[PDB]
Amino acid sequence: EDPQLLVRVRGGQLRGIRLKAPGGPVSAFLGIPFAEPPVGSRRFMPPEPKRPWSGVLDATTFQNVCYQYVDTLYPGFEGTEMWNPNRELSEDCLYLNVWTPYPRPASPTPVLIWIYGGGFYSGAASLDVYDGRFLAQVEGAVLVSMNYRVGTFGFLALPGSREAPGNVGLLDQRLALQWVQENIAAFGGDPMSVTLFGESAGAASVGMHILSLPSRSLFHRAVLQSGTPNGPWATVSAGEARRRATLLARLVGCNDTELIACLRTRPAQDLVDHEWHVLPQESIFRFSFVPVVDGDFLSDTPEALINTGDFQDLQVLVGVVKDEGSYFLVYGVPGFSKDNESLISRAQFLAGVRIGVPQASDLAAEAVVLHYTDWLHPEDPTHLRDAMSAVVGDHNVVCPVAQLAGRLAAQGARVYAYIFEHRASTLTWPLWMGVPHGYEIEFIFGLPLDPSLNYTTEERIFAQRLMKYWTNFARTGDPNDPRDSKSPQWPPYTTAAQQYVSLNLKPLEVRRGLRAQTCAFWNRFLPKLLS
Amino acid sequence: EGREDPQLLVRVRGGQLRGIRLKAPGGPVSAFLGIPFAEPPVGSRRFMPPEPKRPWSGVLDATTFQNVCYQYVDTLYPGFEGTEMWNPNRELSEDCLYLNVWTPYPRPASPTPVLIWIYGGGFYSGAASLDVYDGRFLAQVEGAVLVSMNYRVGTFGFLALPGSREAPGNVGLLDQRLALQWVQENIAAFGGDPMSVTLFGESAGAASVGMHILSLPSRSLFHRAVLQSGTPNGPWATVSAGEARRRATLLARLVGCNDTELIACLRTRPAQDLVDHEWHVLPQESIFRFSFVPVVDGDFLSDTPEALINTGDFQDLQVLVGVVKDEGSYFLVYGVPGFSKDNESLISRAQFLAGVRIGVPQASDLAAEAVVLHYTDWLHPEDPTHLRDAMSAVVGDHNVVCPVAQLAGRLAAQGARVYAYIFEHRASTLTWPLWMGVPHGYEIEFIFGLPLDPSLNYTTEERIFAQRLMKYWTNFARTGDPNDPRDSKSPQWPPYTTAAQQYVSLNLKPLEVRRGLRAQTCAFWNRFLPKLLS
Ligand SMILES: CN(C)c1ccc(C(=C2C=CC(=[N+](C)C)C=C2)c2ccc(N(C)C)cc2)cc1
Ligand SMILES: CN(C)c1ccc(C(=C2C=CC(=[N+](C)C)C=C2)c2ccc(N(C)C)cc2)cc1
Ligand SMILES: CN(C)c1ccc(C(=C2C=CC(=[N+](C)C)C=C2)c2ccc(N(C)C)cc2)cc1
Ligand SMILES: CN(C)c1ccc(C(=C2C=CC(=[N+](C)C)C=C2)c2ccc(N(C)C)cc2)cc1
Ligand SMILES: *[C@@H]1O[C@H](CO)[C@@H](O)[C@H](O)[C@H]1NC(C)=O
Ligand SMILES: *[C@@H]1O[C@H](CO)[C@@H](O)[C@H](O)[C@H]1NC(C)=O
């Protein structure tokens, strides 16, 4: 047996596996349990710590994926399938993964913890895009990723009940963070240098750990890629969550205790079958079961918590891809398709705005339409299509990110910001979608270093830069290379100068103001309109 | 007759006139000044529609300008050309309904396209005798026949008790119409062509031209129109009947006064008493608002200009319309705290928010909020230079640029040939501070060709420029097309259309075609802000 692959954590002994990365080997410990399986009577309940086990637990293979929607619309289409479960589904899914250098690091090593996205209804830490071997092998990082419960299983809430209090999916993530604190030193990891990073719902999750005090003792730095805890999709009120749970119960044949009991009798796939049917409006970029403002995990709305919080001793990296909104249009807006250019009419544009801004009044939707129309080409289908994409991306990601950045920076945080502008040469989504939601991730994780993946040389070199930025941030709270070139420097985001950088094949370029005029509209004016 | 110059004697419907031979830089022109076209609207005629001048006997001397209609005179800045060039330059009187005619000398042998100028001044001031409206250059250089009339302003021109016999409103516009009619009947005596008449005017004068386009009885009196920095639609050029009634009733109270009794009492007040109080009846603290303006009476204006431009057939109308680069700057020093002509007028964010309420005086809190958020630069929300300039743009866009863009849009969509410009040259002689840019009113001296007078110290470039402009305007008056049919070489001026939205820059450089008349911003003013009002 290889000593390198044998590790004792508090629960018992594990055996991992030597994996091949392009530059040499890494030690990988996959499918480590961190919670009692949340099954039967534990459905909807907070996670409990995993009981100690005997002998040597095999940790050479990924565990099951938490029960979720599986996309079948386009069999064999990489653009969808790459996000689908790549192991069997099960409610028994609370496992985490650890990659380290081989041999184990000599000194304590900064740790990166990945929290995946997928609208809080989907995702797994086992997807190929989340493979930690490149970061471990090239940058020497200890990289951790956990499964957390998604959909009803993870966020169905009857607020105030003891058996379905909500947010148990975020409690799963927190327990995984507790586990890293307790155990990661045995892998060569430094528990005193832990960086969370995540994308979309994963980024929103990261932000919710920033805003939830018991999580703050578990990490030191944070990265939010294309998502935020604030904004229109990442949380619901207690009353809306109650409504959604109650309707879903009705839809599958069911006081809180009796209602949750009957829910616990239903096959997992019955809940997934009706998951979406409880959304109040015809919408896109809306997910039925998400974190709930409970007065507990979230003491208040994220909007309220980022406005009033002290973020003095926090470092944060945040950013967006060039085309945040395009991916979502094909899931609900008539006229849009992955299989044609989706050149839409003006009528389709006004109808699309109601779907992409589902909570907007007639008057508010009117303001959006008039702001995003180009009045020199008010009927040009191509402008209208690109405008539809912009409406959804700004409302849901870019302006919530600008809002968070400025609030953090103003209240003491050290903030770095980016826009990612390179379209992967290998993308199977059509060209009109540009740089879609989620297609920076593979570069950050360093997938282009895998020659068999048929990326370009430029892309390999790009990925190495991004791995450096991110691991420099994790080591130091600053993405800049602490000695090497130099330059141009990546400056901190501030309210005065509002500087951010472009991440693309050319060298860093510093820009100022993140959709400043347009996010003023979303962030300062439209709210005055509801009010 | 007998020993007089025989080429200066002329008969019109009311009798014989003697004009005067004037010197223009390049030669003589004929001028017939101070021709009466109405009975003096004095005494019991105050506030009433004009009556046509009854014929006179003998030869009326028409060699000097007549009285200016009774109005406010600006006295704030002793010896300041910037205000003084606009002030009355002849005696103030209610007896003021005269017009002026310039032609070549000798008079033209064949019928000659006529231009009629309608002055601005917020409907509370102005005169056809100001130096800046001098017809001699257009007459001499382009062979134009140019007419300009006085029309009543302020209370005397626009005070209304709508529905009354004695003060029906809009009599100032009727003064203008009477002059147009006078031209139809009489201009042929001077060699003008009554079948080719182009109105042009600036600010309230442009708004006036617009109202003649929109009032059916005026339509037979002209063929083509020019609207410089003004429109009949928009926030300032008209009031409702209700609001005009309110303003006249308040004014009456303030000077110590059944409509008949009320109006009768107003007619006993000294003219200067009315002038002394006319500004006191405005509903809000404001700039670019005037108490006594055309009223939507359901007569001269059958409906609001907005409704009329939205639904009118304009198929056989040619129009030329435009703006100066800085429409709003001039109005800020008249009542937005923080602005002066005598300093750079850098302002704070607080003064900007305050100024937006004064400059958009009918905006609700939410509307004002939308304005401030649109015009704020969020990379530099506190920069006092950006804020000063934004204040100016708010006031300019709201009052002129976007009303002009609405007008151009509707006319183009509803059959008219439209030509649009922006005028971007600042007179080397301007006495207003530099921060004001090209302010409201300061294209006019170039259109009338003042720079051709060497004694005015304009540059050579400005003299060449004035000549280009005099050609655009007079080609437009002749053909409905500003383009020179012989200079096919020079860059062309395309029509404004809804599909391409082309307009040109007027400056020292050759014509440049641009697309979209402040298109995004005017979408806010013209499409969104109204939907908010509801
Ligand atoms: C109009 N209406 C009531 C709808 C419309 C669509 C759905 C969707 C659905 C999901 C799972 C299903 N089963 C497992 C049987 C069946 C349907 C759905 C929604 C969003 C989505 N994505 C955004 C990926 C994918 C699928 C449900 C109700
Ligand atoms: C990847 N991609 C572009 C997709 C993927 C999935 C869908 C939707 C869908 C497809 C197959 C289903 N089953 C086999 C059960 C259930 C739902 C769907 C979503 C919304 C919707 N409405 C809002 C009416 C209707 C259908 C659409 C686009
Ligand atoms: C606040 N308030 C009650 C006001 C404010 C300003 C005035 C103005 C005024 C004019 C002439 C007067 N007399 C002949 C005695 C007296 C006052 C005035 C207004 C505008 C203006 N311009 C825009 C040029 C010039 C003057 C009157 C009342
Ligand atoms: C040319 N220029 C920049 C001007 C011109 C006029 C004024 C105003 C004024 C000046 C002299 C007056 N008289 C000699 C009778 C009466 C009123 C005035 C305007 C507004 C106002 N308020 C809004 C209170 C008060 C006074 C101001 C600036
Ligand atoms: C794309 O395809 C869908 C259906 O497959 C269709 O409804 C839509 O009109 C198409 N769009 C274009 C631009 O052809
Ligand atoms: C200029 O105008 C007046 C001075 O009368 C004052 O209120 C304003 O603050 C001044 N602004 C400057 C000096 O920038």
Numbering used by the authors:
A (entry chain B): 4 to 257, 265 to 541
B (entry chain A): 1 to 257, 265 to 541
The authors write:
The enzyme acetylcholinesterase (AChE) catalyses the hydrolysis of the neurotransmitter acetylcholine, and is an essential component of the central and peripheral nervous system. The pioneering work that led to the first atomic resolution structure of AChE revealed a deep, sterically confined, and highly aromatic active site gorge. The molecular recognition of AChE is intricate and typically involves multiple transient binding sites, aromatic interactions, or non-conventional hydrogen bonds. Due to the pivotal role in cholinergic transmission, AChE is an important target for synthetic drugs used for symptomatic treatment of Alzheimer’s disease, for antidotes used to counteract organophosphorus compounds (i.e., pesticides and nerve agents), and for insecticides used to control vector borne diseases.
To investigate the binding of CV, we determined the X-ray crystal structure of a complex between CV and mAChE, to a resolution of 2.4 Å. The initial, unbiased Fo-Fc electron density map clearly defines the two CV molecules binding at the entrance to the active site gorge of each AChE monomer. The two CV molecules (denoted CV1 and CV2) form a dimer that effectively blocks access to the active site. The dimer is not linked via covalent bonds (i.e., non-bonded). The bound CV molecules each adopt a propeller-like geometry adopting the D3 point group symmetry, as previously determined by Raman spectroscopy and small molecule X-ray crystallography. CV1 is positioned close to the α-helix spanning residues Ala278 to Val288 at the entrance of the active site gorge, with one dimethylaminobenzene moiety directed towards the catalytic site (CAS). CV1 interacts with the protein through an extensive interface involving arene-arene interactions, electrostatic interactions, and van der Waals contacts with residues Tyr72, Tyr124, Val282, Asp283, Trp286, His287, and Tyr341. In this, both CV1 and the side chains of residues Tyr72, Asp74, Thr75 Leu76, Tyr77, Thr83, Val340 W439, and Tyr341 forms the pocket that accommodates CV2. However, as a consequence of the ligand binding, a significant shift of up to ~3 Å of the protein backbone/main chain in the loop region comprising residues Tyr72 to Phe80 is evident. Based on the structure, we conclude that the cooperativity is homotropic (i.e., occur via the binding of two chemically identical ligands), and that the inhibition of AChE is due to steric blocking of the entrance of the active site gorge.
